[PDB]
């Protein structure tokens, strides 16, 4: 395979949430076949961020997912040329985000060109008031809609004061090479955690564990 058991991650995110511009660099490593990745993020411009760092973390690559032999792994078969995704995130108080990633590979390293745009977050809401604690574990439903691999998630962020803040998102995934064969419908379980950070989330260590399954235990 093109994909080694230990891969480096280089990432630049540029974006805008509620008119606040930012640039965030990422350096990390991961184990594509174990579905594990960890990365050091550093805010380069626009810090300290005036919104909950948590809304960005799912934008910071489904190559880092343990796929069983019985499910087509679209993501690992997309290399070395790579793939891109587009995502729309809808929050229960009317917040709406569009994110995309163009993923390429050069030797042992995945390069990530990430864009994140967020709007319509209420000034008094948990995102702009920085009241989020974490994403709850979530299952991504993978299926093909009209020739496009689509991933749906219905999840929530835990807030301070024993409350949840609901988020739905839809991702579309496209291989750069035509004739990478689409998979059957399946699930990917995701856990994402901020392992450490400094005062205003200018430096963040982020971890994700993901596993593909066909539903049954």
Q: Which residue has the tokens 């948590």?
A: 54
**Following CA atoms 209, 14, 19, 135 in sequence, which dihedral angle do they give, to the nearest 10 degrees?**
0
For the chain, the straight-line distance linking the first and the last C-alpha, in angstroms and rounded, comes to: 29
H helix or E strand, kind and range, residue 122: none
Q: Which residue has the tokens 């990478």?
A: 180
- Provide the β-strand partners of residue 26: 11, 41
DSSP assigned state of 50: S
Strands, E, within the chain: which ranges? 7-17, 20-31, 36-45, 83-91, 96-106, 109-119, 132-135, 138-145, 148-159, 163-175, 186-197, 203-213
Q: Which of these, 158, 159, 192, 155, lies nearest to 170 by C-alpha position?
A: 155
On the CB side of 33, CA atoms within 13 Å amount to 7
- Provide the β-strand partners of residue 152: 141, 170
**Following CA atoms 66, 100, 15, 132 in sequence, which dihedral angle do they give, to the nearest 10 degrees?**
-50
Which CA distances in Å does 189 have to 65, 78, 124, 177?
A: 9, 21, 32, 27
Q: Which residue has the tokens 């990530």?
A: 112
Q: Which of these, 209, 198, 11, 204, lies nearest to 104 by C-alpha position?
A: 11
Q: Which of these, 120, 156, 161, 124, lies nearest to 139 by C-alpha position?
A: 156
Strands 109-119 and 36-45: unpaired
Q: Which residues contact 193 (CB under 8 A, 6 or more apart)?
A: 134, 206, 207, 208
- Provide the β-strand partners of residue 15: 22, 116
Sign, Cα dihedral of 169, 50, 165, 24: positive
Can the peptide bond before residue 80 be classed as cis, meaning omega within 30 degrees of 0? yes
Helix (H, G, I), strand (E, B) or coil at 55: helix
Structural resolution in Å: 1.8
Q: Which residues contact 40 (CB under 8 A, 6 or more apart)?
A: 26, 27, 28, 203, 204, 205
Can the peptide bond before residue 48 be classed as cis, meaning omega within 30 degrees of 0? yes
Q: What is the DSSP code string of 135-160?
A: EPPEEEEEEEETTEEEEEEEEEEEET
Which CA distances in Å does 15 have to 68, 90, 149, 203?
A: 35, 17, 25, 17
- Provide the β-strand partners of residue 28: 9, 39
Residues 49, 213: Cα–Cα separation, whole Å: 36
């Amino acid at each position: 395979s093109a994909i080694k058991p230990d891969m480096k991650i280089k990432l630049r995110m540029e974006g805008n949430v509620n008119g606040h511009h930012f640039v965030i660099d990422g350096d990390g490593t991961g184990k594509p076949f174990e579905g594990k990745q960890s990365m050091d993020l550093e805010v380069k411009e626009g810090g300290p961020l005036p919104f909950a760092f948590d809304i960005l973390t799912t934008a910071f690559n489904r190559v880092f997912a343990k796929y069983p032999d019985n499910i087509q792994d679209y993501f690992k078969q997309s290399f070395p040329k790579g793939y891109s995704w587009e995502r729309s995130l809808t929050f229960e108080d009317g917040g709406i985000c569009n994110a995309r990633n163009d993923i390429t590979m050069e030797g042992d390293t995945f390069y990530n060109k990430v864009r994140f745009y967020g709007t319509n977050f209420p000034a008094n809401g948990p995102v702009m008031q920085k009241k989020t604690l974490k994403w709850e574990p979530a299952t991504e439903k993978m299926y093909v809609r009209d020739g496009v691999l689509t991933g749906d998630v219905e999840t929530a962020l835990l807030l301070e004061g024993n409350a949840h803040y609901r988020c739905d998102f839809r991702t579309t995934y496209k291989a750069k090479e035509k004739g990478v064969k689409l998979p059957g419908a399946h699930f990917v379980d995701h856990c994402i955690e901020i392992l450490s950070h400094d005062k205003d989330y200018n430096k963040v260590k982020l971890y994700e564990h993901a596993v593909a399954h066909s539903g049954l235990p």
